[model samples]
Target: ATSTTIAKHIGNSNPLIDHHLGADPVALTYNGRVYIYMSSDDYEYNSNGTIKDNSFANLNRVFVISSADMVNWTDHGAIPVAGANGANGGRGIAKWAGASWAPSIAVKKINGKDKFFLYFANSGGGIGVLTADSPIGPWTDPIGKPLVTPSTPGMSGVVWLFDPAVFVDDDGTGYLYAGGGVPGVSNPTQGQWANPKTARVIKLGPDMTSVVGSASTIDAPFMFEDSGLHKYNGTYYYSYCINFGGTHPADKPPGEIGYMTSSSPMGPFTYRGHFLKNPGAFFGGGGNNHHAVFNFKNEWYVVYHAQTVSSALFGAGKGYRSPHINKLVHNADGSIQEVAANYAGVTQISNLNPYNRVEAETFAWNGRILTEKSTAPGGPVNNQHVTSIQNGDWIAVGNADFGAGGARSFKANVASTLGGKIEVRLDSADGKLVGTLNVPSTGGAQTWREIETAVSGATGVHKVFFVFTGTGTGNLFNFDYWQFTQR
Candidate 1:
């Protein structure tokens, strides 16, 4: 008997996240919420007008974002890396902290209480562990040092000890997967894979710190780096980033997300094909595509990133990048279908409640508008509004159900120097102007103000677009959060 379940995508949109430049995404589903942990791309630029080069420096914290509806997300803020919290403008938590690059997380029950475990990497090629009471953490370094050091057992051939992925199986067995660089006499940041092995899968004891036994070498097919381990439908998926130019069968593309599978978690398995393709030197300088597959409310999706600055739109020549998510399709024979990258990401599984307090940065689709900390009165609450909102720029909140009576009024928290108007439209950019909230200058961009206006015909379920209009050369205003009052 063939027993199978079907998976499908709701809609299409790209760049699920754009505010913080990021890379190497790890998607985790927990307690009805999906949290995406990413490597913070907060770069350190030099006085020479070029990005500074160091061993992953200034990435001193793990950045995380959470979503329940998948359309609107809440920034949970940075969880400081393990080390003494220093005063380096609240960025550096550990003095010796490396780039604080791509990492992973696992939640386990300890003493009948859920305790969260964080596994991260240092700039100098070492892995560390931290424990917290919650997903948003006041994390404490438990191992006090690198848990997977270069000198650690089974790490002999490891060229780089970064890009961690962890999982706790059904039987309460914890497994850690790591290592994502080629072999060399010396460490080379990026190069072809000359060695047969590059990644590892190791078992962790019940304590979550000590290794249970020797590390098992992963015979991951054409595996260059970024080892992620997850189980779905009685199948163990070992997903990883492939070094596009590896010793392959001549046909594979460089820098795409690929995977291997086994009937068992620790296995001698078969190679499943790639899902997302590399956009091919995206934006003139984008590679190293990291990805994760997750299921939310019965639907499956693939989460990855692309270079933001492209010849098409958004940034160009600026290597800033952002993450994107698309629907993942699987065949009836238990094989995954290759996914083509699309501008339209997945569809909204549910409608956003406009009556509640909503962060403006939570967008379904946006036009080149970047975000930054508001100069407004209130200090940072771990979130800032969409800045650089030029004239004609719009933010779309797809599939918002306004119910029968519709909305009576709209209000937004805004700040402006050039002062503009928010043309609240339904369905299309110019579909139907339901309301117009005129924002006046607050003397300064950081000086905050609230603008409210009456609304009409905003009933039923529709895509709400905040079309910005004004006369300005720079940003018109900063948008933080907004809410609607029902009739």
Candidate 2:
């Protein structure tokens, strides 16, 4: 199920942002940092060349934020603009006029260092390419040319190419994915635009300068539209949603998130099925689509948009859409797990959960707080044991195993009170911290720390593990015993 519980969205405030509307998210990870950018609010066009009450251009702009870890986030306001001539090159140059909406981006190693190339479509104009020094950007139109070229009008269309999603391969080749099946206007959708050619993925030349091959087509609504492509286990997957018509819930049934995969990035993709059928509490309404697959710390995250309405703000319009980020679970064979409408977390699971494997991964409860007779520094330090540990924390001897299974994992939360360094080790100073190690929680008392190392040398039932590791020199730690939920 897909429910963005109030708990998961721990840091929620009014507009979610101090200023503009945070719509349509496109996340990119660079140098161990997660950069989140979304379609922004720049301003709309009017009979007077500028509309007073228009929220159009505003939503068309792009905003960004970066986080080394998902728990703490840093916001960087609106930087990319495309809609109806945002400042039109600032001083008023129509040549630079356009709309920045429905974005797609990629971060890859270029030369020796990492470079971020953005391919966004001008929702109000034509498709264009934008470049930035970092994911947190001061972006500029590359050479100021439309990326997809204008093709919407000639086929009885008025709007240009928009909704740009970028897919880059391992060899540093970049592919620009955009609409190719919007019925008549774009591709060949069965409904509006109905263009079978509604969405597409065209290869970008070196330096990310130009489009190479003609756009290739995939299945409509289900596979090709709003496609977010990613490579996993040596195969490429393009995940998207259809049936959900654009941003208007009124135009769609209850939306769904679907996907397709292929051996190549260009893709002769096969039907993989929908990853998420109902975007219930996770996402508010039918306007659920445009999914981005972000792999952080070797884990995959499915980031997408969901509709949230406050008052009776229906048909007239769903209030500004909210961005939803969730962990995407995949099977060992690379098959994706299907999610329901209100799938929060482990809460929906029936019985035996596999998360507690007793290996290094099972020790992932670091920084997650646990119960205690009393609280201590870092968080609720567990005095549950009289084991000889530094500062009274548990250490998981790396490379040590607790027999075959029997819950060998030692878990601790970031101390709830004054946060600081903590570690787990064997009885001696020469032993390494247990299998898993978590980072310091900057949340102070705001969140728990979750880290796990690997241990495979344990021959006893109760091995002594120093609860905290990486001395909290530069970090503030909190520990909760619940940090480890053994299976």
Specify the highest-lDDT model's number: 1
lDDT of 1 by residue, 322-403 (tens): 6677788877766777876665666667788889877787666566576654554553355657887888777777788899
TM-score of 1: 0.82
Go through the candidates in order and give each one's C-alpha lDDT: 0.71, 0.49
Model 2 lDDT, residue 391, Cα? 35
Clashes per candidate (backbone, < 3 Å): 15, 104
TM-score, every prediction: 0.82, 0.58
Segments of candidate 2 deviating more than 4 angstroms: 1-20, 41-55, 83-95, 151-160, 184-195, 221-224, 244-254, 278-283, 309-317, 340-487
